[model samples]
Structure formats: structure tokens, C-alpha cells
Target: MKLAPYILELLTSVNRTNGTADLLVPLLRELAKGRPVSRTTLAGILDWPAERVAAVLEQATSTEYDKDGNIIGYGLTLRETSYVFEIDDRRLYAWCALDTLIFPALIGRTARVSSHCAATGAPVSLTVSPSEIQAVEPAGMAVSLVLPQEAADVRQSFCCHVHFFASVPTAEDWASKHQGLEGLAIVSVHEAFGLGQEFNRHLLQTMS
Candidate 1:
């Protein structure tokens, strides 16, 4: 999938800043990076370009040995895949280039395209921003979704709150930590997990 020009710019800029230029520049300038990916139908992040992201990957480099012996898709090949996924709870984003250009704001490189990816039988190529990724897990069984009524209990920040959610095991535990933020965030407890998307959208929709 083609990244939005802004997203492309963002990835290029991020790579230059974080020493990931080898990882991204090979992609941005080449429009094709890495060995050829295999599967004809699949989903996930492809650090590479859209014309080649989908298809069963070669079995030689798989991480897990499933019963089918199918190699994990290429999108999962990169270590950054974790930044694109979560286990249970919902992650709140300040701005999602996938959704409307809402909250947070797509400054720097927040405009990657891993959302609404299943439209085509292809994987979406994306440049995920570190700050935009959040993993929402059950904090603990003892927590509550609403904040404590006491004024003293109000939290002043939500940045560390997400990390706190990683420790608890209940829904409320996660919610309590999410409260008292300066702005409302956009989140959905959808049956969602990874940040992978389809190449079609990346080409047709995002690149504008």
C-alpha cells in the first residue's frame, strides 16, 4: 500500500531522527524493500511496499511453528509489529490517521495507515508512531471504570496511566487510571488487535 505523502514524509523524518533510516529509507525511496513476501491473502504490517506485502511468507524465517507450517506473514517479520498490536483492552489514541483527523494531532509521523486494512486481501504498509501506540490490558480485578469521587484521587496525567493499566487485571482498574485527562480520547473496544492494514486503502485512500 502506498503511504499518504504525509505519512511517507513522517516515516522518512522519524527514521532520520531515530536512526531507523536504514529501515525506512530503503522503503520510502525504493518503494520496495526486503525479500519478496509470499501469501496472496493475509493481514498485518508490511515494513515494505504494497505491491509486494501480501502473500504467504517463506517458512524459513517464521517466529512460531503453527500446525500448518505456514510462515508468519512478512508484516510480522519486523520487530515493530508489537507497536501495532494489543491483547485485550482498548487503546486510546490522541489522533488516528486511520480514523478522522481527530485528537492528539498528526504531528511528526502520526499519519501511518494500519487502520481499516481488511478491505482488500492484502496487508497494509504503515509507519507507526511510538506515542500513538497504546496497549490496554486489564489492570486488576479490584479496580473500577469510573474515577474515585474524592477530589484528591484525580489523576493529572494519562501518559503514565496506560503503563499503570498494564499492571492491573480488571476493567475498572484500567478506567480509573484513564480518568482526569485534559481531553477526551477516541477509543473502541472493538475486536481489534494489530495495526496492520490492507494495501488497497494505502494506495487508494491514504496517499492523498
Candidate 2:
């Protein structure tokens, strides 16, 4: 999709998990500060709702600010991803990558900030997938998913890196740790590229 650049920066600033509420909330709260924004106004700008925006601000602030509350000092040090669920009426899209770090960063940032925007409203967003976004609730819905590598200015993004893997896991058991990371079966992802399960499994087993 045609996401803004700041969103990309925000995504990369987080760890591999795709979030740093310590970092994210402050950035968001900073945007919310010094402005007479009400729940509705902020929500309207973000294309969400007042209540959601208010709740996010509360969550982002991590502590409520009553009339005499003090501003939070720097660095709350909480790095979390998918910390909150989102409900947005926005379209979704995907981008194809050619083994570049930019794709992963883009995927992460799109999902992260889009979740933020979907939860809030200003710069409301949809997810960015490096390969595909399967099972979007509103199936076949139109979204702004775009592949920047396909652009004429792709060369301008000088820092892109290319990574090649024999096989990527389809499901990395998140059930292991409170926060585990993995994909679908490596077989499934490989199959998407017309490679069969037998060959894919063999390749993954060798890597394992």
C-alpha cells in the first residue's frame, strides 16, 4: 500500500517482534499532545472511533492522566507486538519482495502502525504483507497493498538487503514462549511457489 515513510521508520525501530510500545506510545502521545483533540476528533482523523482512540491513549500512556497527573518520564522499556487487536473498515493489500530486508521491515511496519491506526484513527491503516495476507476477515476487499520494489524510485531505497532462505517455517510455535515466533508449515509457504511438501520438508529438515 501507499503507507507514509514515518510508518516504515516506526516499524524498524522495534525489535523483530514489530513493536515497542515504549517507543510507539510516546510517539503517538506526542502527536496527541498540545492539541485540544477530543475522542471524536482524533478518531475521525484516524477513521476509527472516539472510544477506541481514548482507550489507546490510555493504553499508550500506560497510566491514566488525571487533572494533576505528571507526564511520564522517558523510556518505559516495554517492547510488545500485536499488543492490542484492531477493528478497521479499511481495505488491505500486499507487496511482493525479492529477498530484501526492506520487505521484512515494510511488512513489520505496515502491520504495526496499521494496527495502531486501525485502533486509533488518524492515518488509519491496513496490514502490509511481504508475500500475502491470507484470511483477511473481509475477503476480496480492496486495500492499498503495494510493492515498492516495483517502483521507478526503488533504487532510491538504497538500504534494501536481499536474503535467500532454502525454507521458511509456516508455523513457528508461539505456544512455546509467551511470545514465540514462527510461520505456517515451511511446506505451505514453499508450496505457494509451486514446490511440493516432500521437497520442502526435506529442505527444512536439512536446515534444522
Candidate 3:
């Protein structure tokens, strides 16, 4: 039998086990501080074996690990991956441009994001809150998302990483630059947040 093609479906299916969120939720709060977290450090802090910590990170469903054992991502942290988050005095990272935009709402904390235009390298920054967004530089902006080749892998494939651009031309330039890049799509910040809100709703739901 053949199957029908479908648009990308995110936030529809999920994975998370009880007690996992206890470590995962607070961990996200830590990552939100704009710092990198090592598994060994997390294991000591959580009082679990390193292997168990790895298991939780793997099973947490949205966590991204590198070739090394460090926890480079969870909800918003994309350490050394993309520059989209800044919190407190630390320069943090994000899974995508929208991660910085949506996380302030998720944690009810204010966020300051500084990134560059993908096209011209012009500086861009924004102050985001649960209530409103204050663009420090109102340049054209767009965020990218990569639809997975297989729906079953969407949850694990976030490592593909969305990118931010200063304008539609820059975004389109990027589209052409990565000629073999599949499933890449770009949308405005508002549209990105629309999807991110659903992702957060599910993340919080599973956390509860």
C-alpha cells in the first residue's frame, strides 16, 4: 500500500515519562540562564548516575545532545549552535531564532536577544516578555524550520536547527546557498511564535 503525503505536523505527538520532568523542567530553567550544562555536573546536581542523566536527556523528547556527552539543548539551549538567546549577564544560545522569542513566555521571565542579519551581518536585538516584544532594531526578520522527511523523527530531528534572517532576501539567499537542504522553510517571527506557543503548551502539559 502507498501512503499519502502530509504537511509537517509538530506538537501533535509527544514523549515524556513521570519524574523525568522533575529533572528536565528545572534543567530547562538552568539552560535559560544562557549557560552550557555538562552531564557530569547535572548528574552531581541531580544526584543521579551519569548514565541515568543521559537516559533522561534522551527520553525527555526535546533535549539535544552533541557527539560529546554534554547536554547542549533542552527546549531552548543550543549551546555553540546558534546565537539567539541572552539572559541575565550570560550570553546564551537557542535552537532557533524563535527559541529566544518564545522562551520568555514559557518561563515568565524577560529575555534579551542579540543576533545578526543572515544577509548583511547587520546587528539585531530584541527585548521579549510574556506580554510584549520590544524590537531594539526593527529590521526585517524571519525564522526557519526544517520539516522532517519522516514524521516519526520530527521530535528527534530538531537538531537540524532553525535559523534567523534579517530580511526575506537574506532568507532566500540562504535557501539558495544550501541547495541540498531539504525541508527548509522560513516564516515571520509572529508565525514562528504561533508554532512555538503550541510547542510550549505541549511541553508544559507533559511537564505536569
Candidate 4:
């Protein structure tokens, strides 16, 4: 399946407004520290009024907060997930397989990714740098993709469906069970990373 168009459509659904993107970049970076981040700290980092930050946070429904109202998960998260994203000395998690691929570029950090293939339960490992991906285990690993539904909660509507597979055949096997599902495709890890690069470029451009 052609992925570029789907990639663009997914981005539009994810960031409904420019302000959401603006808040997300810093939020993801801070969350990568493997700790829950406070609204005050995020406001301080952005040098925005606390009210301004609060307004943006309210609109960003995908943000997961702790009981104390500290941000725990955005894309890069402190909570456990199907995909593990380890950077620096911190072990973090991502909302989905695509987040694992894209966040390295978005946050300008390298990540060691660990996940199980959806079909076979085989371990998939890779090294994702800001500019490229390497050390991909199995060499034939694939990533699932889906164009998100508009105005829906992305974590449930999109993230729950995306995952890594050990190979194309295995990905196809997993996709078969979700028959009649539209906007679903299995693409090579390299292709997924290229799509992520496009997303990162557009998102960072908007932030600037």
C-alpha cells in the first residue's frame, strides 16, 4: 500500500491545531526523561504562562497524567507498553510502534527499541537514531500502519492497532484477522522510518 498519503492524513488527525504540535514536541522530550513531568515544569520549559500551557494540555486529550496531575505519557511515556524505547540511561515506552520509530527524530535522540512481533511473538530489536535506523534484528521486520479516524482518541483509535511483526508474511497473517479493516498496511521497517522522517520534518517545521 502507498504510505505517504496515509502518513500525511494520520498527522492531520493527530495534531488538530498548531498549538497541539507545539506542546507535543517539548512534552515528548521531557517525558523521555523516564519521569512524570509537572505542568509547572512544562510551562517553565516553554516559558509560557501556566494558563497558556493548561489550555493546550486540556485540548490535547491523548496526554496521560498521574494522580498528582503530572504528565506521565504522551508518545514517549514512563508507563509500560508493547514497545519499549530505551534512551540514555532511561527505559521508556511509546504509545505505539510508529511512535517508537518517529520519536527519535522528534526528540533528537537515539533509542534502542524492543518489542514482540504481533503474529509470532518473536522479539524484534533495533537501534533508531535521529537520522537513521540500524541494528535491525531479523532484517525483515515490518511495522503495521493505520490512518487514524478523525477527531477520535488517537491512543485507542490508532495506537492500539499498530505493532511490529517479524516479517511480511507474519504481518499479513496478523492483518488477515482484522479483515475488512481499511487503512491498514504492513510496511518494511525502513519504509516506516522514512515515513517517520517525513512526519518529523513537517512537525518540526510547524514548531519553528
Query: How does candidate 1 fare on TM-score?
Result: 0.20
Local accuracy of candidate 1 as per-residue lDDT tens digits, 1-208: 1223323432332222222322222222111121222332222233444334322122112222234543222222222321232111322221122221211122223333332221122232233342433322221111111111222212222112221112223334345445564332222321111111222223224231
Residue-wise lDDT of candidate 2 within 100-194, one digit each (tens)? 11222222322311222111222322232433433432222221112223222221231121111222220222112223211212122223222
Scored by TM-score, the top model is 4
Local error of candidate 3 at residue 28 (angstroms): 1.4
Alpha-carbon lDDT, every model: 0.25, 0.26, 0.63, 0.86
Residue 168 in model 3: shift from native, Å?
Answer: 2.3
Model 3, position 159: C-alpha lDDT score: 40
> Which should have the higher TM-score, number 1 or number 4?
4
Which wins on TM-score, candidate 1 or candidate 3? 3
Per-candidate TM-score against the hidden true structure:
0.20, 0.19, 0.68, 0.95
Global fold similarity of model 2 (TM-score): 0.19
Off by over 4 Å in 3: 1-23, 34-53, 59-78, 149-161, 176-182
User: What is the lDDT for 70 in model 3?
Assistant: 61
Stretches of candidate 1 above 4 Å error?
1-81, 84-172, 184-187, 191-208
Winner of 1 and 3 under lDDT: 3
Clashing pairs in 3: none
Cα-lDDT of candidate 2 = 0.26
| Distance from true location, Cα of 204 in model 4, Å | 1.2
Scored against the true structure, residue 128 in model 4 reaches a CA lDDT of 96
